[PDB]
Amino acid sequence: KTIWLQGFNSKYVNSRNGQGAMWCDSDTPQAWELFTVIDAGNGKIALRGNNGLYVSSENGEQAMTCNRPAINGWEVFDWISNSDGSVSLRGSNGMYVSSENGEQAITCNRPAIDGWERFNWAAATL
Amino acid sequence: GSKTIWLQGFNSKYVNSRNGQGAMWCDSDTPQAWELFTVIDAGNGKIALRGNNGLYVSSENGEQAMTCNRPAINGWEVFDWISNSDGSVSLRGSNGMYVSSENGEQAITCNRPAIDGWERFNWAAATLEH
Numbered sequence A: 001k002t003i004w005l006q007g008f009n010s011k012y013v014n015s016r017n018g019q020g021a022m023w024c025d026s027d028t029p030q031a032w033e034l035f036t037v038i039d040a041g042n043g044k045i046a047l048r049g050n051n052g053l054y055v056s057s058e059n060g061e062q063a064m065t066c067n068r069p070a071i072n073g074w075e076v077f078d079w080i081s082n083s084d085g086s087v088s089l090r091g092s093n094g095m096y097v098s099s100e101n102g103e104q105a106i107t108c109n110r111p112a113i114d115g116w117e118r119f120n121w122a123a124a125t126l
Numbered sequence B: 001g002s003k004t005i006w007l008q009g010f011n012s013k014y015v016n017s018r019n020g021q022g023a024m025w026c027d028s029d030t031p032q033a034w035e036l037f038t039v040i041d042a043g044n045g046k047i048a049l050r051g052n053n054g055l056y057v058s059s060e061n062g063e064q065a066m067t068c069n070r071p072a073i074n075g076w077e078v079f080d081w082i083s084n085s086d087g088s089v090s091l092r093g094s095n096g097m098y099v100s101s102e103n104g105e106q107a108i109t110c111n112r113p114a115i116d117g118w119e120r121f122n123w124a125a126a127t128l129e130h
């Protein structure tokens, strides 16, 4: 299924069409804010963005992207289901996807879940 | 590696080439090397699927279970890539019949004439490169 991910700053995770880094900066979920959750096997998930490419952790080396033409790895995630119904995403490197409060592009370099690393999600299409 | 994909049945198992050895099954718990298929352009808007053994997936015209042991493309090895309403995909062989996971209960087939629950697959492009 296709979902949007809403970050700590109340904006939505934006694939940026695979140009440059991903950001948590959109006011409303539209095509670029819809991600197909992929069952990558063994509790791991991947995310296919609007451009048909896959979200990568970049191993924490740089801000996260949505440009990979195929899942390997840096593109599989643990989908952690939090107490409050939110989700966190843990990358290949054991670090957590962070919305960075919209202050900078999204990262996967933080070793623990805090506010910025919890997302509200709901299924949506079109 | 943008055209090498896996196919996941709604039974949550992945389509498996069986490395040519016998019929294909939708029973693998994890998308491994036998679970990856390169989508080859077969012309006229049709596609072929080449398994890990470098050979081609065949419908067998629905007369027996599907196999991945053809050296080259003809047909029973061409398929329509059907994109479904829900994000899943289906594959319609040259006989007009659709590829079925058979819910992992028997080997994969291509003899059912319409798209039902076992003829819809989740897909993703994946690579073994690490």
Ligand SMILES: OC[C@H]1O[C@@H](O)[C@H](O)[C@@H](O)[C@@H]1O
Residues within 6 Å of the ligand: A014, A026, A029, A030, A031, A032, A033
């Ligand atoms: O409507 C498709 C996309 O257009 C872009 O210009 C916006 O930044 C995205 O947020 C939107 O999802």
